[PDB]
Amino acid sequence: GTTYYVSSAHGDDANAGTSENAPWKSLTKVNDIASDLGPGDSVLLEYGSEFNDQYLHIKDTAGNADAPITISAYGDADEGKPVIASNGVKGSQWEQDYRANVGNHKNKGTVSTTLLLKDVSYITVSNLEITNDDADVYDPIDTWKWTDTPDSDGTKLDRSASRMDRTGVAGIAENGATMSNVTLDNLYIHDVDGNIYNKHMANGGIYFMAHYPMENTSAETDVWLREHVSRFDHVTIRNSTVKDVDRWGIAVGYTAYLNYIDANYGDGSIDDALIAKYGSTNVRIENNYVKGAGGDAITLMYCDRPVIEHNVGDSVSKHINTQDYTQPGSYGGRVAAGIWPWRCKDPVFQYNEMYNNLNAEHGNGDGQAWDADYGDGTLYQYNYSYGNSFASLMICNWYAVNTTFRYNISQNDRQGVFDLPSNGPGNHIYNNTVYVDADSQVLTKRSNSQSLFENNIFINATNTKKTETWNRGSQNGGQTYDNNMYVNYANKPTSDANAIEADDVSAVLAGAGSAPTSALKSGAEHARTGEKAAFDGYRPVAGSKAINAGKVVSDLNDYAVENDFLGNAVKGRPDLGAVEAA
Numbered sequence: 001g002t003t004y005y006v007s008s009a010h011g012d013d014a015n016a017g018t019s020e021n022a023p024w025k026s027l028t029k030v031n032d033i034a035s036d037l038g039p040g041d042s043v044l045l046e047y048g049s050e051f052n053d054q055y056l057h058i059k060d061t062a063g064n065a066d067a068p069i070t071i072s073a074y075g076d077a078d079e080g081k082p083v084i085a086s087n088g089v090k091g092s093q094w095e096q097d098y099r100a101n102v103g104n105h106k107n108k109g110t111v112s113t114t115l116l117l118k119d120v121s122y123i124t125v126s127n128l129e130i131t132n133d134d135a136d137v138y139d140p141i142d143t144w145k146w147t148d149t150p151d152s153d154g155t156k157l158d159r160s161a162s163r164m165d166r167t168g169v170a171g172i173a174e175n176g177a178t179m180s181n182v183t184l185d186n187l188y189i190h191d192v193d194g195n196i197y198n199k200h201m202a203n204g205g206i207y208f209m210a211h212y213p214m215e216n217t218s219a220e221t222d223v224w225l226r227e228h229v230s231r232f233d234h235v236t237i238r239n240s241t242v243k244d245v246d247r248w249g250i251a252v253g254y255t256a257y258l259n260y261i262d263a264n265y266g267d268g269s270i271d272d273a274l275i276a277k278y279g280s281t282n283v284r285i286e287n288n289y290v291k292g293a294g295g296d297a298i299t300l301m302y303c304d305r306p307v308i309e310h311n312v313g314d315s316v317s318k319h320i321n322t323q324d325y326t327q328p329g330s331y332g333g334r335v336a337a338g339i340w341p342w343r344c345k346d347p348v349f350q351y352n353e354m355y356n357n358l359n360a361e362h363g364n365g366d367g368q369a370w371d372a373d374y375g376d377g378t379l380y381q382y383n384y385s386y387g388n389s390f391a392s393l394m395i396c397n398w399y400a401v402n403t404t405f406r407y408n409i410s411q412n413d414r415q416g417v418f419d420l421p422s423n424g425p426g427n428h429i430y431n432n433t434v435y436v437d438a439d440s441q442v443l444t445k446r447s448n449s450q451s452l453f454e455n456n457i458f459i460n461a462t463n464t465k466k467t468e469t470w471n472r473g474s475q476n477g478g479q480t481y482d483n484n485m486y487v488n489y490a491n492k493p494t495s496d497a498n499a500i501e502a503d504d505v506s507a508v509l510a511g512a513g514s515a516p517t518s519a520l521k522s523g524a525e526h527a528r529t530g531e532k533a534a535f536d537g538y539r540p541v542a543g544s545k546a547i548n549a550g551k552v553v554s555d556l557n558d559y560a561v562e563n564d565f566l567g568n569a570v571k572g573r574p575d576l577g578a579v580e581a582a
């Protein structure tokens with residue numbers, strides 16, 4: 001196929017694209033033929049290019065497995081990624097309509113979008129910087145702090161509830177058919193000043209969503225919509241930084257087809273066929289950095305077996321507070337968690353890091369790193385949480401079930417490591433190493449529900465043998481413990497007749513508490529091995545009453561144990577906590 005070229009300083013729209021010598025000036029000419037691309041076609045923007053009050057929309061087209069369509073950059077990276085900056089002009093705006101009720105949320109209206117991919121399959125977007133900046137909204141995360149008075153620091157927000165929604169990248173399936181093999185690589189999406197409140201408009205750094213193509217008006221429409229489903233397959237977002245956005249950081253899969261998925265909640269478990277038909281399959285979220293979202297960092301919605309891995313979340317829920325979240329209406333949502341799933345089936349979050357989820361002190365009713373929310377089979381394993389304002393993990397309400405949370409490290413997470421408010425049964429916390437300071441404890445004050453702790457290292461990182469509340473409530477069999485190491489505590493649970501008490505954390509681990517306090521400047525995950533390994537602190541020491549003292553464990557939700565936090569194999573007698581020792 002063909003390849004067109006663009007340069008904001010050269011080009012001249014009266015050119016021809018096709019060759020690097022002869023490019024276009026603006027994206028006007030690219031909008032014009034986007035919809036006629038094109039398996040093996042490509043469009044490329046020269047590093048250093050700055051396209052203001054501009055946008056790229058692209059509708060109803062495809063490559064194929066042989067050859068994707070490709071949107072990207074060309075020649076001498078050390079120039080600046082090419083910047084697309086819509087500034088939410090009229091031309092970026094389109095009319096979003098789920099064409100179905102999807103909860104107490106705005107589900108229809110005008111949305112500004114810098115890069116829209118509306119039913120485009122077999123495409124790959126690359127090495128692009130994307131803004132959707134209001135000049136009249138300024139509140140950067142790098143400099144953010146809590147103030148007695150709103151906007152008293154040279155910052156300014158539009159707290160209007162009817163503020164227009166804005167996306168960096170929106171991905172939209174509304175033809176009653178699969179959108180597939182879409183790929184976002186690199187991308188620096190930042191300063192996307194959307195609506196502070198709206199959870200399910202295309203409002204945030206990157207949002208992928210599905211709509212009914214028609215509103216469901218009759219028996220005959222219902223017959224049709226059951227079998228013709230807008231949905232995603234083989235979506236992959238990776239190596240990207242989403243920073244300073246409102247509201248969501250990265251969201252994929254919210255679908256009008258939840259009117260089918262959530263038809264029979266009861267018991268809480270999610271049928272495979274149902275999620276595969278109506279939901280979104282082969283979703284990968286990979287090696288990204290989310291910093292300073294207004295709300296949640298990363299979320300997978302209505303996804304069949306997604307893979308969320310090697311991502312870094314940092315300092316989100318920036319606008320989830322009483323100063324900024326002033327006009328919630330009847331919608332609520334003054335509430336956010338870090339990296340989590342919503343009505344997914346057997347997802348896997350792994351090798352991720354989550355720092356400093358904000359404002360649980362200032363009106364964020366959540367504030368956790370992780371949230372096994374409604375849905376089934378959630379898997380968190382090999383994740384590090386640090387310094388979050390309210391817990392490492394929540395397991396949320398009646399229809400959150402069958403969670404496994406394992407070989408993870410919580411460090412200085414605050415107001416309790418484990419939040420269990422009325423969650424459903426089947427959850428298994430095991431083999432995690434939790435460092436619990438004087439701002440925290442093991443369980444949140446509001447916990448009252450099921451979990452089964454086994455093979456964990458619970459560490460009292462205060463200056464006194466603590467008498468802890470290990471049990472609040474008895475909903476779905478309350479919290480039961482067996483085979484856990486308790487360090488520097490004055491007690492244990494009345495329900496762990498196989499306890500392993502220890503007295504000093506220095507005789508148990510190499511250097512507890514010394515894991516990182518902030519994401520790396522880059523946004524990358526921390527090294528776990530080699531010169532720069534930043535988790536060595538949590539390796540047991542020669543002679544730890546933690547070596548070989550875990551019982552072999554029958555993961556309640558049929559998940560095969562495989563390796564520890566650091567990834568070395570776990571065979572034989574499992575070493576207590578999340579690390580094994582060479």
Ligand SMILES: CC(=O)N[C@@H]1[C@@H](O[C@@H]2O[C@H](CO)[C@H](O)[C@H](O)[C@H]2O)[C@@H](O)[C@@H](CO)O[C@H]1O
Binds near residue numbers: 333
């Ligand atoms: C059960 C519950 O209320 N859970 C909260 C989550 O809320 C749901 O979020 C989904 C998002 O797809 C949708 O908006 C639904 O209508 C909401 O109830 C969510 O807010 C989560 C993260 O902060 O917290 C839970 O308390």
Ligand SMILES: [Ca+2]
Binds near residue numbers: 133135138191193
């Ligand atoms: Ca701005």
Ligand SMILES: [Ca+2]
Binds near residue numbers: 150
């Ligand atoms: Ca402020």
